[PDB]
Structure 1
Amino acid sequence: AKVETHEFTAEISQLMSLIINTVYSNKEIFLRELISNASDALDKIRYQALSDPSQLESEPELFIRIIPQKDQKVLEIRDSGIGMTKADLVNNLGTIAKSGTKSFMEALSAGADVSMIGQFGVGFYSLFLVADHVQVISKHNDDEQYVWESNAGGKFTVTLDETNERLGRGTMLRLFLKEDQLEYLEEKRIKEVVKKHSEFVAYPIQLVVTKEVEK
């Protein structure tokens, strides 16, 4: 029930500051990056399930689900992948993310397109193109459901999840959209971006749409 605060490594907080402030034109590549991460997490549970089919019982369906929350100015990207333990959420640091972050920043200084972020293994942080803060809700088969939270600053929190829907297994990113990036709540826009950048995905990409029942 305690909110644990942790500090990012310097290189991660440097990267998040660059991304949250960039005026880069093609911000829609965030969604490709998060879909790719979701797909990778799904691949990992599928791989475990091949030897042990009981690892799927926590959530039998393998999906990616996009949930616009228009009233909250939130976009949720959910997967039923392997998920992250509390120790996985606290271990964003001492990771390959450290190696990805410094060389990507150097590449950006040399003129690399921001869309190359995924090639450096740090495409998660592309969410700061469109969002000023994020909650990462995750449930691994070996642990309880936890919430990781960040505002692109130096600090993050990890809290035992007593407030969100149960994932069963997997991860949900809750993006708190910037006031100029509310186009990513619209069905038409999300469909366009998925179709353009995420044609080759092995799992269903489900879009959750809320419409008024009319006369």
Structure 2
Amino acid sequence: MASETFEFQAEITQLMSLIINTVYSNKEIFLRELISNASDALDKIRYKSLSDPKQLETEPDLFIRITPKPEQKVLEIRDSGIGMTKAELINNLGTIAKSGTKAFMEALSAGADVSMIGQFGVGFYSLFLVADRVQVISKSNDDEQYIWESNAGGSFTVTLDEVNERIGRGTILRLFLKDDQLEYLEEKRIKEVIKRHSEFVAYPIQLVVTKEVE
């Protein structure tokens, strides 16, 4: 419907502007960070299900799925984890977080690997190494499906989702890739990045491949 607009906490803006603009070389690290977050969200629904198995029924399969959408210059990273309510999207992604965000920027001013970002709990924002815009589409068992959208630029929107496929339960990160980062639409490239840095994941990592017949 109508979107609601929110202001990012200043430190999150600071972190994002730095990441979207950085000339840091090893931009592929974004995928390990998002796979790690997906795995963590799956751990949470699995754990919750130990005492409330009905929570799994909205999506009984536990998976991470990567879907390139070349025409739209989009890469989607989906999980069937715990998901986020409207309030959780606003909370987890924009208006609070803090969270080692300041400490990570300080570690950068001193020379840390950008690749250390996950150790500060803010690996999500590494997506701006390869994307200039993101939609986070999420469905918690506790709320309706919502879309959080950011272009790294100070404000974000949250909208009740009347436009995307229903996700049973979980989260899609829909990355709108930069024009010079379209290699991450390629099956060969995605496979190599996954295999090298995400070796001990307990859930299947599914790659959606679209190919012409004959």
TM-score bracket, shorter-length normalisation:
over 0.9
Q: Is residue 172 from structure 1 mapped to residue 172 from structure 2 by the alignment?
A: yes
What's 2:142 paired with?
142
What's 1:120 paired with?
120
Q: How does 1:189-204 map to 2 (within 5 A)?
A: 189-204=189-204
Letter in 2 for 1:35: I
**Quick one: structure 1 residues 60 and 129, their matched pair in 2 at CA, closer, same or farther if it must change by over 3 Å?**
same
User: Does the 8 Å contact 2:7/2:94 carry over to 1?
Assistant: no
SS across alignment from 1:24: coil
Q: Distance in 2 between matches of 1:7 and 1:93?
A: 7
Q: Distance in 1 between matches of 2:99 and 2:213?
A: 50
Q: Distance in 2 between matches of 1:186 and 1:153?
A: 28
Q: How does 1:65-104 map to 2 (within 5 A)?
A: 65-91=65-91, 92-93=93-94, 95=96, 97-104=97-104
Q: Distance in 2 between matches of 1:180 and 1:137?
A: 25
Report deviation, 1:90.
Answer: 1.2
Cα deviation code 1:139-182 (max 9, x no counterpart):
00010000000000000000000000001000000000000100
Unaligned stretches of 5+ in structure 1? none
Q: Distance in 1 between matches of 2:90 and 2:191?
A: 33
What's 2:63 paired with?
63
Letter in 2 for 1:126: S
What's 1:42 paired with?
42
Q: Distance in 2 between matches of 1:84 and 1:100?
A: 21
Q: Distance in 1 between matches of 2:31 and 2:54?
A: 31
SS across alignment from 2:202: coil
Q: Distance in 2 between matches of 1:181 and 1:100?
A: 28
Report deviation, 1:99.
Answer: 2.9
Letter in 1 for 2:99: S
Q: Distance in 2 between matches of 1:89 and 1:58?
A: 19
Report deviation, 1:16.
Answer: 0.2
What's 1:129 paired with?
129
Unaligned stretches of 5+ in structure 2? none
SS across alignment from 1:194: helix
Aligned residues: 213
Q: Is residue 111 from structure 1 mapped to residue 122 from structure 2 by the alignment?
A: no
Q: Distance in 1 between matches of 2:178 and 2:15?
A: 18
Letter in 1 for 2:13: S
Letter in 1 for 2:114: V
Cα deviation code 1:102-157 (max 9, x no counterpart):
00000000001100000000000000000000000000001000000000000000
Q: Distance in 2 between matches of 1:84 and 1:142?
A: 8
Q: Distance in 2 between matches of 1:16 and 1:160?
A: 25
State percent identity of aligned pairs.
85
Q: Distance in 2 between matches of 1:161 and 1:185?
A: 25
Q: Distance in 2 between matches of 1:201 and 1:129?
A: 23
